Amino acid sequence: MFEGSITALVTPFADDRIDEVALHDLVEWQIEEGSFGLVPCGTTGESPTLSKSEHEQVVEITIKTANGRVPVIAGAGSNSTAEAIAFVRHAQNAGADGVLIVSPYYNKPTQEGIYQHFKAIDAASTIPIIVYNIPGRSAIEIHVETLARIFEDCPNVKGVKDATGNLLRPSLERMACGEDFNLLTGEDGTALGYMAHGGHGCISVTANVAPALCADFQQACLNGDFAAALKLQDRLMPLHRALFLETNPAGAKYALQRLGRMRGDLRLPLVTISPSFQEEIDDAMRHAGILL
Amino acid sequence: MFEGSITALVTPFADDRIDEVALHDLVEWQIEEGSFGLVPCGTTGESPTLSKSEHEQVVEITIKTANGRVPVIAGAGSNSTAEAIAFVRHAQNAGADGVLIVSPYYNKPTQEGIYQHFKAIDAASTIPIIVYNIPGRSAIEIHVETLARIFEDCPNVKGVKDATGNLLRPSLERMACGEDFNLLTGEDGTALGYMAHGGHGCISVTANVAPALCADFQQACLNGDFAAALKLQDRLMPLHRALFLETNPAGAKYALQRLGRMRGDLRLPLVTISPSFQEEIDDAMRHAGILL
Amino acid sequence: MFEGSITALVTPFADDRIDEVALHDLVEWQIEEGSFGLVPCGTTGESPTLSKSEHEQVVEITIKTANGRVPVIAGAGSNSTAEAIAFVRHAQNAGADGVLIVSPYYNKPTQEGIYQHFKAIDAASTIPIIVYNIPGRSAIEIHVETLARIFEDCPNVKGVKDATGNLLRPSLERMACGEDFNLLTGEDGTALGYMAHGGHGCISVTANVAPALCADFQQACLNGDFAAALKLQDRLMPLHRALFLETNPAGAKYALQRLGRMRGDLRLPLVTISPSFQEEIDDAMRHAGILL
Amino acid sequence: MFEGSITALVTPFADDRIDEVALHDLVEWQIEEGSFGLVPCGTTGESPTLSKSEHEQVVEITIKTANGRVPVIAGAGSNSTAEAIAFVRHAQNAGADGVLIVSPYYNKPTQEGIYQHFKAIDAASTIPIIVYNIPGRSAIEIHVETLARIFEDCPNVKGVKDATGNLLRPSLERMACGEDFNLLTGEDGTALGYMAHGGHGCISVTANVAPALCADFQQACLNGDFAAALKLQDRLMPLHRALFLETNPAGAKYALQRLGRMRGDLRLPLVTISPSFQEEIDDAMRHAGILL
């Protein structure tokens, strides 16, 4: 199974193009810093504003740079089943260790619809699928029973990236699906409590800016050392909330730009985080020890 | 100014391709039945599962078939501002009378980002822009001030397709945006109250199956004859209700298939409406006198 | 049948006691201004902070002052069925024309529990019962079937005070519950659309400050003259909007205090409306011609 | 500070009266089983359907039976500030170790309102106050800053009973309020993750039926032994969800009645849990080892 701090990579842009060098450097630093894995082209990587070819470039750059040192789980979802499949076919042919498929957004399929969506994607897949359940953005939910049915009927579906904010979920999924079900969290601020519930790791936003600390936090939870994990939460909380002041990845890109690791370029409809929030992010990093 | 019953056309499929003959006969029948305008490739037209080439063919076939008889407002939204500009450019170049731009879905942009979204689109447009405010699918809202500011700074933005279900909106918008603001409803079952609050029409789902009755309903509303509009509500409510028993357009396609105007084919993640719901739709059409 | 502008009376306080002189003059002025009916001790009458003895005095003073000129529908709800029966018994024994029973709040009963709630109250009643469906405060809903079932099995249940903000409701209720079902709105800003969908009136908050204009609005609606009703909306919307800038009845009490009809005294946990909002209310009253 | 498994006592009824003997026995068994504390007259104890005198009897019976062996935190909230104070004055004069004050429900006070509510209650209090934040029932929220302001300005306010379902809360409160802030959870199913976040205990529903296991679970979390806690969660999850199948305390009373510890009598508008759910609760207890 996948575990620990798995970074949901921000996608650096420069001159309206993918910043190849900044991305390679981001991935390398991410690995030498301790990340257990990478997720290129997720929501944090601004997948919605990426072109088909850019998405492919980012997945491939990430796969070639990681060079098998850590798992690479390519974001390959869509609210169109046929397109999710095209993305999944590219990911696996590119050497990806797995894919992250979000629940169809906007068109609000029924549970049977969501079921058939993943069954079709599972069929065209040859790698691990992690179901990305985030009702807050997709405007639809994946019921525990539906999730359980998908896990049971789709050999490639191995787990979930839970972003419901409902902590009964990891426990209810441990019941519906066994202990062999891969439980990953999609939200940093509550990863502490998610791990206590039997979670395996977190596809992280904060790890983009504080990779080493997030790695230690995760490793601390994996070692069952929740006291250390708490102290780490104490150090990382200001950043966890500051990174979400407005809409992610606006804060993560400001943070990484403030660190001189990329330009802070965001693509419309997203815009640069508000200035007062930029200060809060600064003090948040100073508090974590990231910013001098 | 757009008004009356503007049909949000369902996109007929056959053998995994656009059913062009069915699409043509739908637009035609729709026009001879009295519809005030057509909206090809909206959410009811399953735009999310349409290839970019299919999107274009559907818009063009509708425009060519309409032959200037009724306005054609092309769906051209996207959660990528760059992509939205591409749909708008194509549409206006194809002869569309305007465009339906939904608020960016899933990526949850701030209010300033939404404002910049529409300002960037307005700069690339040469045709009327209607803002599709539907929080329940986009997982984001467009505050009245934001909407008023967009109307003020964007010369091509002429109105809204309100799908909030909050009837204070048209009143609040009449205040913030003058009476020259084009008010259209996105929901059939509450169009009656919307028109009473000063609405100008409705971009309809029900108009797909009962074009004649809906057009009359709107005409009553427009003539201020709300007594007749209510009588029509009594006749259409069962259908308005049944068409939404599961996620739209599953219900409308079942109905048009039952009426023999196309195949009920839907694309994943969407699935055919449940059988007990098919019966309710049958009874609603019989009640509306659409079926014998 | 209840109809028109039924004022949900604010409860005037002075020196931590009911201001009886102010209450009497409010009911009187309200009646000579044209209000169709009065609802003492509703949520706008701060029933939650009223002692049981104060509740009774307010109901009785309103009834005595009304002197049979307009119907008096007494607030008698509670999240305790036993307590609701006590309020209803007192009310009818005091000469109330009916009772306003809110859905049980906070304790979130199932639909069967709500049904039994109203069935137990209907058995103790001898006067008309109106069901106050307001999900936003009660944190619970009354499905249409449940509401229809209550209407069917409870001879004293005559209608609803809809405060869902879902305009499909009156239409769906017209279907499930015949046209003999008394439809009243709980929200002023959407009364216009409610009446167009077949509503019979509105249990108003705005009618407290502009009894004359609201009564006219309702009369227009009732006469099917929606053109005039819209014109009145234009005149009342600013006020409908300002009266709800913060939690009601904070806005209405500020307005009636500014008009010199009572003290602005509110009981904790409720506090006086913010100063910038007081100004917006002032401007709204000036716009509605209520203030010079 | 308060910690561990603090039971939110169900209130046994018999012949429409408080079942004095069943309650005494419940409290004794609760103590000999390992409970770290008792909360008489909370939501689980059906405070909404209790009379002023019954509430007082239950608090006093609980205080006399506990006989100082464990803390007794009397539920003393209301959406009326004056009444919360009356309840708090009785609790402390009765020998209570603290009180549980819910955020005002139904009347939706503003944050300043909620602030003044607790400031007034704090003033009339001489014992610890735990703020019960449960937006799901109260239909209002207590912002972190508001909570922090209340903690800082009210010497008697020592902590919170968090029932938001938002795990960022314990971490954000650890930041706003220090480590001296008493963090108690209001929801059993996510207590595991709450403790990982620095939680001190849980005012429990499940502890009513499985007091010893909930005690061990809590003690396990207090000892920082999250591996054991997980195994305990594994054993207790079926009961945690089964106890909330319908509306609490309907399942808790069925469970305790199934154990022969009281009659399952519930007060309207609440009703007995559905039969199929009674079976699920049975198997849930058999799974936990409670039921033979």
**Contacts with D171 from chain A: Cβ below 8 Å:** 189-190, 192, 233, 237, 240
**Contacts with B250 from chain A: Cβ below 8 Å:** 110
**Contacts with B8 from chain A: Cβ below 8 Å:** none
Annotate A167-221 with three-state secondary structure. Answer: CHHHHHHHHHCCCCCEEEECCHHHHHHHHHCCCCEEEECHHHCCHHHHHHHHHHH
Q: Do B197 and C195 touch (CB under 8 A)?
A: no
Contact A259, A251 (CB under 8 A): no
Hey, which residues 48-87 in chain A have their CB within 8 Å of chain B? 48-49, 79-82
In this structure, what token pair is assigned to residue D108? Answer: 């939706």
Most C CBs within 10 A among B169, B192, B245, hence the mutation to make, goes to: B192
CA distances from residue A29 to A38, A291, B85, D86 in whole angstroms, order as listed: 12, 16, 36, 61
Nearest to C122 by CA among C92, C94, C95, C142: C92
Cα gap A194→D197, rounded to integer Å: 9
User: Which helix (H) or strand (E) element contains residue B93?
Assistant: helix B81-93
Which string of DSSP letters, residue by residue, matches C101-160?
A: EEPPPSS---HHHHHHHHHHHHHH-SS-EEEEE-HHHHS----HHHHHHHHHH-TTEEEE
Start-to-end CA distance of chain B, whole Å, equals 37
Cα gap C253→D288, rounded to integer Å: 55
Residue A123, chain B, CB below 8 Å: the answer is no
**Contacts with D108 from chain C: Cβ below 8 Å:** 137, 247
CATH code of the domain covering residue A150: 3.20.20.70
Contact B80, A267 (CB under 8 A): yes
Residue A119, chain B, CB below 8 Å: the answer is no
Q: Which residues contact C235 (CB under 8 A, 6 or more apart)?
A: C213, C287, C288, C289
Most B CBs within 10 A among C169, C194, C195, C226, hence the mutation to make, goes to: C226
Cα gap C63→B261, rounded to integer Å: 61
Residue B153, chain C, CB below 8 Å: the answer is no
Sign (positive/negative) of CA torsion B232, B235, B238, B243?
Answer: negative
* Nearest Cα residue in chain C from D272: C113
Contact D213, D236 (CB under 8 A): yes
Q: Do A137 and B108 touch (CB under 8 A)?
A: yes
Method of structure determination: X-ray
Nearest to D166 by CA among B78, B184, A165: A165
Cα gap D266→D282, rounded to integer Å: 19
Residue C117, chain D, CB below 8 Å: the answer is yes
Cα gap B76→B83, rounded to integer Å: 9
- Where are any strands of DSSP class E within chain D? 4-8, 13-14, 17-18, 37-39, 73-75, 98-102, 129-133, 157-162, 182-185, 201-204
> Which chains reach chain D with 3 or more Cβ–Cβ distances below 8 angstroms?
A, C
Task: Output the CA angle C198-C204-C210, nearest 5 degrees.
Answer: 120
Choosing from B115, B158, B161, B254, the catalytic residue is: B161
- C and A make contact (3+ CB pairs below 8 Å): no
H helix runs in chain C, sequence order: 20-32, 52-66, 81-93, 111-124, 135-138, 144-153, 168-176, 191-196, 211-222, 226-242, 250-258, 275-287
CA dihedral C136, C138, C140, C141 (to 10 degrees): -70
Most B CBs within 10 A among C168, C172, C234, C240, hence the mutation to make, goes to: C168
Cα gap C149→C176, rounded to integer Å: 9
Instruction: Please give the distance of CA A215 from its chain centroid, rounded to a whole number.
Output: 14
Which string of DSSP letters, residue by residue, matches D42-83?
A: STTTTGGGS-HHHHHHHHHHHHHHHTTSS-BEEE---SSHHH
Q: Do C196 and B196 touch (CB under 8 A)?
A: yes
Compute φ and ψ for C258, nearest 5 degrees. -65, -30
Active site residues of C: 132, 161
Contact D39, D73 (CB under 8 A): yes
**Contacts with A190 from chain D: Cβ below 8 Å:** 166-168, 171, 193, 197
DSSP, res A72: B
Cα gap A71→A182, rounded to integer Å: 14
DSSP, res B175: H
**Contacts with B205 from chain A: Cβ below 8 Å:** none
Nearest to A190 among D167, D195, D221 (CB): D167
H helix runs in chain A, sequence order: 20-32, 52-66, 81-93, 111-123, 135-138, 144-153, 168-176, 191-196, 211-222, 226-242, 250-258, 275-288
Cα gap B105→A48, rounded to integer Å: 9
D145 burial level (CB within 10 Å; 0-12, 13-18, 19+): exposed
Q: Do A226 and D166 touch (CB under 8 A)?
A: no
- Interhelix angle for A52-66 vs A81-93, to 10°? 30
Which string of DSSP letters, residue by residue, matches B112-152?
A: HHHHHHHHHHHHH-SS-EEEEE-HHHHS----HHHHHHHHH
Q: Do A113 and B48 touch (CB under 8 A)?
A: no
Residue pairs between chains C and D whose CB atoms are closer than 8 Å: 119
B21 burial level (CB within 10 Å; 0-12, 13-18, 19+): exposed
In this structure, what token pair is assigned to residue A16? Answer: 């309206």
Cα gap D225→D215, rounded to integer Å: 13
Compute φ and ψ for D19, nearest 5 degrees. -85, 85
Q: Which residues contact C19 (CB under 8 A, 6 or more apart)?
A: C12, C13, C262, C263, C265
Chain B: nearest CA to C106, how far in angstroms? 24
Cα gap D16→D115, rounded to integer Å: 37
Chain D: nearest CA to A185, how far in angstroms? 12
Tell me if residue A248 falls in helix, strand or coil. coil
Cα gap B78→B99, rounded to integer Å: 12
Amino acid at A225: D
User: Which helix (H) or strand (E) element contains residue A8?
Assistant: strand A4-8
Residue pairs between chains B and C whose CB atoms are closer than 8 Å: 99
Q: Which residues contact B85 (CB under 8 A, 6 or more apart)?
A: B120, B121, B124
User: Which helix (H) or strand (E) element contains residue D255?
Assistant: helix D250-258
Amino acid at C229: A
**Contacts with B187 from chain C: Cβ below 8 Å:** 168
Hey, which residues 235-274 in chain C have their CB within 8 Å of chain D? 246-247, 250, 267-271
Cα gap B103→A262, rounded to integer Å: 29
Tell me if residue D175 falls in helix, strand or coil. helix
* Nearest Cα residue in chain B from C189: B168
Give catalytic status of residue D161 as yes or no.
yes
Resolution in A: 2.0
User: Which helix (H) or strand (E) element contains residue C202?
Assistant: strand C201-204
DSSP, res D88: H
Q: Which residues contact D10 (CB under 8 A, 6 or more apart)?
A: D26, D44, D45, D46, D208, D249, D252, D253, D256, D262
Nearest to D80 among C49, C82, C105 (CB): C49
**Contacts with A167 from chain D: Cβ below 8 Å:** 165, 167, 189-190, 192-194
Q: Do B49 and A120 touch (CB under 8 A)?
A: no
Nearest to B198 among C165, C230, C241 (CB): C230
Give catalytic status of residue B161 as yes or no.
yes
Diameter of chain A measured on Cα atoms: 52
Q: Do A192 and D195 touch (CB under 8 A)?
A: no
Nearest to C192 among B189, B197, B237 (CB): B197
Nearest to B128 by CA among B182, B172, B178, B175: B182
Contact B111, A110 (CB under 8 A): no
Chain breaks in chain B (C to N over 2.5 A) after: none
> Which chains reach chain A with 3 or more Cβ–Cβ distances below 8 angstroms?
B, D
> Which chains reach chain B with 3 or more Cβ–Cβ distances below 8 angstroms?
A, C
Instruction: Please give the distance of CA D11 from its chain centroid, rounded to a whole number.
Output: 12
Hey, which residues 172-191 in chain C have their CB within 8 Å of chain B? 172, 174-175, 187, 189-190
> What is the tally of structural domains in chain B?
1
Nearest to D196 among A166, A195, A240 (CB): A195
| Residues spanned by the domain of D55 | 1-292
Which residue matches tokens 């990528």? B80
In this structure, what token pair is assigned to residue B197? Answer: 């609050």
Q: Do A240 and D170 touch (CB under 8 A)?
A: no
Q: Which residues contact C219 (CB under 8 A, 6 or more apart)?
A: C4
Q: Do D189 and A171 touch (CB under 8 A)?
A: yes
Q: Do D192 and A196 touch (CB under 8 A)?
A: yes
Amino acid at D143: H
Contact A114, B269 (CB under 8 A): yes
**Contacts with C81 from chain D: Cβ below 8 Å:** 49, 267-269
Cα gap B144→B232, rounded to integer Å: 31
Residue pairs between chains A and D whose CB atoms are closer than 8 Å: 101
Cα gap B262→B264, rounded to integer Å: 6
CA distances from residue C22 to C48, C255, C258 in whole angstroms, order as listed: 20, 14, 14
Chain A: nearest CA to D224, how far in angstroms? 7
Pairing of strands B4-7, B37-38: parallel
User: Which helix (H) or strand (E) element contains residue A7?
Assistant: strand A4-8
Which string of DSSP letters, residue by residue, matches D93-113?
A: HTT-SEEEEEPPPSS---HHH
Instruction: Please give the distance of CA B190 from its chain centroid, rounded to a whole number.
Output: 14
CA distances from residue B260 to A134, B26, B238, B278 in whole angstroms, order as listed: 38, 11, 20, 14
- B and D make contact (3+ CB pairs below 8 Å): no
**Contacts with C175 from chain B: Cβ below 8 Å:** 237-238, 241
Nearest to B65 by CA among B94, B89, B45: B94
Nearest to D11 by CA among D57, D48, D61, D58: D58
